Amino acid sequence: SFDFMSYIITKAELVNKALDSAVPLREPLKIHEAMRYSLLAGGKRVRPVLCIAACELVGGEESTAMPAACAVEMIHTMSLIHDDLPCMDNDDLRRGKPTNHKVFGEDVAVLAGDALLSFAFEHLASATSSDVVSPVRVVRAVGELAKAIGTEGLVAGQVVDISVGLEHLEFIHLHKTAALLEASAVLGAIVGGGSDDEIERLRKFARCIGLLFQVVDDILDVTKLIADKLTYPKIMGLEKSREFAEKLNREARDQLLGFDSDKVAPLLALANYIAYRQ
Amino acid sequence: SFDFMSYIITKAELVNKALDSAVPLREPLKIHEAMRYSLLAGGKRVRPVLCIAACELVGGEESTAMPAACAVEMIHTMSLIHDDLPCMDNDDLRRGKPTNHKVFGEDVAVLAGDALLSFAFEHLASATSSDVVSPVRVVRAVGELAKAIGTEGLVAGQVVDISSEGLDLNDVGLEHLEFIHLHKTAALLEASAVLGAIVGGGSDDEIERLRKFARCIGLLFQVVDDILDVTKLTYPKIMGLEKSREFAEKLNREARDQLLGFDSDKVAPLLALANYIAYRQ
């Protein structure tokens, strides 16, 4: 009776409403319309949905986890805004409509990215209710989100993505993609009341579906600046890439043995969806 | 007797050692060299020192506030790195040295600023001692620093400044002027004093008086350097020159009045800093 598609839609639209209430437009406007433009451009919202999922699985409520979920989608948005800039990437179109700096300028773009990054923390720290989550856990959460974006996560992956073999590729993907996914699963588990063991199993899970996205997207492109030429089928061959993708989907499904029964359904569905898209 | 310069030199030197140790050269290296380059290029280090001062005044220990101080100076560094970008007030030279985006790419500059901003929070949350400072206070701190950087602080100031728009007519543009300086300079001064107070164990009342103190010397920096430059948008031309001198001495008074009630020997550095900023030639 479980519908993955119905799940993903109600969760995403719930998240979108939260993002709208969290960054209203006011005060100095150009900056807020700049933030809102990129932040409320919709999306699959996979990172916040994964964070709400991880919270529900360990027993927390959908609402406890909302500000954490908003925080990781703000980090995600900021990483894209600073990507599209001319010094890097230099793309004028994202999802059809033009990029943030092509509408407001590279100046307001850099600044809007910084504002989203800092508001992420302000929101995770202030809006997480003091009546459900102990300060200890909010502190641990902040530390994890920050670790995830810095030089052991998102930023390390972006720098290296500019300048030969397998661990170079895996490096870029563990930091650019998997680090913030890990942060999403782990934050959900933390503020949702999860135990240390549960938090480590959700970290491993997120790391696995984070690589899986990438191996599968590289396989799909041949079956129809550095991470474009360098693909898993080029390095491993196509068969070894497919075996790799099923080792990863397996390990992801096995981290979820041990949670019981009910709230594993969405995460299992997510894993299979990423694994077997066509 | 109390020696102000001896104080500021031992304190800055202490901060410098703290920052070198918090951002070592690890991998990947080019980014760590980009961060280190701007973070350890020396400087007066007034914000972290203000934060340490504020911690000691409310009863806390010097070492307690050290990660908070490193956080505010990292944030400050990012604000300089992103100030210099070509899209933003392009500056080929910072200090006397070439700018961060002129040594590494502009891309590595943007990313280094992002790594510094994030490490501020990682370091403030992770490295702050869990048995001297309660998590409740660490949470409040994360919030004050974040608020300080955002659109109610630093970034609101850098936008209304390089972005639209103000009227510089005297005496109309007066509240435009205050706005730019309350956000571009004083927001982060307020955060460092407040961080210092929060983490030193100070009460909700100490904290608001040190917040006002910091707001006053933050405005004071600006009024005084504008007064010295007459010896686009400035205090003597919007308000001054005489009304500016009285404004600067009102600000010095009020800053000195925020310190009554503390015990009179750990106020000496803050008083000295105030009088120093206030009186130049």
Tab-separated table of all heavy atoms in Angstrom, chain A residues 1-2 14 30 45 59 69 74-75 84 89 95 104 113 128 197 200 209 211 218 250:
chain	number	residue	atom	x	y	z
A	1	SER	N	0.818	-1.211	0.000
A	1	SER	CA	0.000	0.000	0.000
A	1	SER	C	0.860	1.273	0.000
A	1	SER	O	0.310	2.378	-0.121
A	1	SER	CB	-0.955	0.030	1.218
A	1	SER	OG	-2.007	-0.920	1.129
A	2	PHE	N	2.187	1.136	0.134
A	2	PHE	CA	3.061	2.321	0.245
A	2	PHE	C	3.401	2.897	-1.130
A	2	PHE	O	3.894	2.206	-2.037
A	2	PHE	CB	4.351	2.008	1.034
A	2	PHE	CG	5.348	3.156	1.074
A	2	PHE	CD1	5.069	4.326	1.783
A	2	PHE	CD2	6.574	3.060	0.410
A	2	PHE	CE1	5.986	5.393	1.815
A	2	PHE	CE2	7.490	4.121	0.433
A	2	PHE	CZ	7.191	5.291	1.139
A	14	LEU	N	5.552	20.059	1.597
A	14	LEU	CA	5.678	20.477	2.996
A	14	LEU	C	6.984	21.262	3.252
A	14	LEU	O	6.995	22.344	3.889
A	14	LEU	CB	5.623	19.251	3.889
A	14	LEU	CG	5.612	19.510	5.380
A	14	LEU	CD1	4.197	19.861	5.822
A	14	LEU	CD2	6.150	18.268	6.096
A	30	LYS	N	16.656	43.427	-2.173
A	30	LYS	CA	17.348	42.791	-3.271
A	30	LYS	C	17.992	41.519	-2.803
A	30	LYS	O	17.965	40.545	-3.508
A	30	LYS	CB	18.357	43.688	-3.951
A	30	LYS	CG	18.776	43.082	-5.269
A	30	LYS	CD	19.694	43.970	-6.075
A	30	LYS	CE	19.919	43.421	-7.482
A	30	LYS	NZ	21.263	43.755	-8.028
A	45	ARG	N	14.102	18.097	-3.776
A	45	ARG	CA	14.299	18.353	-2.349
A	45	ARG	C	14.761	17.088	-1.636
A	45	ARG	O	14.341	16.812	-0.528
A	45	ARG	CB	13.020	18.869	-1.676
A	45	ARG	CG	12.391	20.136	-2.232
A	45	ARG	CD	13.313	21.300	-2.075
A	45	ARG	NE	12.705	22.533	-2.539
A	45	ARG	CZ	13.384	23.623	-2.863
A	45	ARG	NH1	14.701	23.620	-2.823
A	45	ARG	NH2	12.745	24.708	-3.251
A	59	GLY	N	12.106	7.646	15.389
A	59	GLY	CA	11.009	7.923	16.301
A	59	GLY	C	10.543	9.359	16.474
A	59	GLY	O	9.529	9.606	17.121
A	69	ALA	N	16.106	20.346	8.189
A	69	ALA	CA	15.826	20.095	6.777
A	69	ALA	C	15.948	21.359	5.925
A	69	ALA	O	16.491	21.333	4.795
A	69	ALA	CB	14.439	19.490	6.632
A	74	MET	N	19.150	25.046	2.289
A	74	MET	CA	19.883	26.319	2.147
A	74	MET	C	21.375	26.144	1.822
A	74	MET	O	21.931	26.913	1.031
A	74	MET	CB	19.753	27.149	3.405
A	74	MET	CG	18.371	27.666	3.613
A	74	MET	SD	18.174	28.432	5.223
A	74	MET	CE	16.391	28.385	5.370
A	75	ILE	N	22.041	25.184	2.474
A	75	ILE	CA	23.430	24.888	2.134
A	75	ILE	C	23.501	24.404	0.695
A	75	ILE	O	24.404	24.775	-0.061
A	75	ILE	CB	24.061	23.809	3.048
A	75	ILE	CG1	24.004	24.228	4.524
A	75	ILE	CG2	25.459	23.472	2.580
A	75	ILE	CD1	24.419	25.652	4.772
A	84	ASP	N	27.473	28.433	-10.060
A	84	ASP	CA	27.116	29.046	-11.313
A	84	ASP	C	27.906	30.260	-11.640
A	84	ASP	O	27.816	30.743	-12.732
A	84	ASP	CB	25.659	29.458	-11.311
A	84	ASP	CG	24.708	28.313	-11.469
A	84	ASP	OD1	25.098	27.231	-11.911
A	84	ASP	OD2	23.528	28.512	-11.150
A	89	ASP	N	32.384	27.144	-13.295
A	89	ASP	CA	31.246	26.655	-14.051
A	89	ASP	C	30.787	27.600	-15.125
A	89	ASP	O	30.792	27.285	-16.298
A	89	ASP	CB	30.078	26.334	-13.123
A	89	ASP	CG	30.386	25.201	-12.169
A	89	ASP	OD1	31.277	25.367	-11.321
A	89	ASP	OD2	29.742	24.133	-12.262
A	95	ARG	N	17.815	24.654	-14.788
A	95	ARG	CA	16.447	24.126	-14.858
A	95	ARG	C	15.514	24.954	-15.758
A	95	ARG	O	14.289	24.915	-15.594
A	95	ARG	CB	15.845	24.016	-13.450
A	95	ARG	CG	16.127	22.711	-12.711
A	95	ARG	CD	16.192	22.964	-11.212
A	95	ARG	NE	14.844	23.081	-10.669
A	95	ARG	CZ	14.354	22.331	-9.691
A	95	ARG	NH1	15.109	21.391	-9.132
A	95	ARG	NH2	13.102	22.520	-9.293
A	104	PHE	N	20.483	39.069	-10.905
A	104	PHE	CA	20.864	40.090	-9.903
A	104	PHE	C	22.335	40.548	-9.886
A	104	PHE	O	22.669	41.531	-9.219
A	104	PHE	CB	20.514	39.602	-8.481
A	104	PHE	CG	19.130	39.020	-8.340
A	104	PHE	CD1	18.872	37.685	-8.657
A	104	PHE	CD2	18.088	39.795	-7.845
A	104	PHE	CE1	17.586	37.143	-8.524
A	104	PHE	CE2	16.802	39.258	-7.700
A	104	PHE	CZ	16.557	37.930	-8.042
A	113	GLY	N	24.637	33.912	-1.386
A	113	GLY	CA	25.205	32.646	-0.954
A	113	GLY	C	25.688	32.718	0.485
A	113	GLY	O	25.359	31.856	1.306
A	128	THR	N	15.021	25.189	16.062
A	128	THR	CA	14.933	23.872	16.662
A	128	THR	C	14.409	24.053	18.072
A	128	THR	O	15.019	24.769	18.872
A	128	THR	CB	16.302	23.180	16.641
A	128	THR	OG1	16.633	22.893	15.276
A	128	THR	CG2	16.301	21.877	17.447
A	197	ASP	N	24.536	4.427	17.659
A	197	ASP	CA	24.546	3.361	16.663
A	197	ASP	C	23.620	3.617	15.472
A	197	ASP	O	23.982	3.376	14.302
A	197	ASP	CB	24.168	2.055	17.329
A	197	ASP	CG	25.021	1.760	18.550
A	197	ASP	OD1	26.271	1.763	18.420
A	197	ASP	OD2	24.444	1.534	19.640
A	200	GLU	N	25.180	6.281	13.287
A	200	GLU	CA	26.239	5.762	12.416
A	200	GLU	C	25.713	4.877	11.272
A	200	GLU	O	26.259	4.893	10.147
A	200	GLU	CB	27.274	5.004	13.238
A	200	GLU	CG	28.143	5.926	14.075
A	200	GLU	CD	28.828	7.028	13.230
A	200	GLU	OE1	29.553	6.666	12.257
A	200	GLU	OE2	28.638	8.244	13.525
A	209	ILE	N	23.944	5.753	-0.686
A	209	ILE	CA	23.087	6.258	-1.753
A	209	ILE	C	23.676	7.524	-2.421
A	209	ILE	O	23.367	7.802	-3.589
A	209	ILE	CB	21.644	6.559	-1.282
A	209	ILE	CG1	21.654	7.679	-0.263
A	209	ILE	CG2	20.983	5.330	-0.722
A	209	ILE	CD1	20.316	8.259	-0.025
A	211	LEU	N	27.008	7.938	-3.211
A	211	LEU	CA	27.783	7.436	-4.355
A	211	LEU	C	26.926	6.805	-5.442
A	211	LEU	O	27.246	6.868	-6.640
A	211	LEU	CB	28.811	6.398	-3.922
A	211	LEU	CG	30.083	6.897	-3.302
A	211	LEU	CD1	30.866	5.701	-2.829
A	211	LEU	CD2	30.795	7.616	-4.445
A	218	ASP	N	26.375	8.261	-14.105
A	218	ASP	CA	27.425	7.991	-15.096
A	218	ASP	C	27.099	6.781	-16.015
A	218	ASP	O	27.365	6.829	-17.212
A	218	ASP	CB	28.787	7.805	-14.410
A	218	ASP	CG	29.425	9.144	-13.945
A	218	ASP	OD1	28.829	10.233	-14.187
A	218	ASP	OD2	30.541	9.091	-13.344
A	250	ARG	N	23.008	-2.755	-2.215
A	250	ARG	CA	22.977	-3.754	-1.156
A	250	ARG	C	23.428	-3.222	0.226
A	250	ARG	O	22.656	-3.277	1.184
A	250	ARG	CB	23.818	-4.949	-1.568
A	250	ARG	CG	22.974	-6.169	-1.878
A	250	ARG	CD	22.934	-7.071	-0.654
A	250	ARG	NE	24.274	-7.591	-0.367
A	250	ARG	CZ	24.746	-8.741	-0.844
A	250	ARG	NH1	23.972	-9.495	-1.615
A	250	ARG	NH2	25.980	-9.142	-0.546
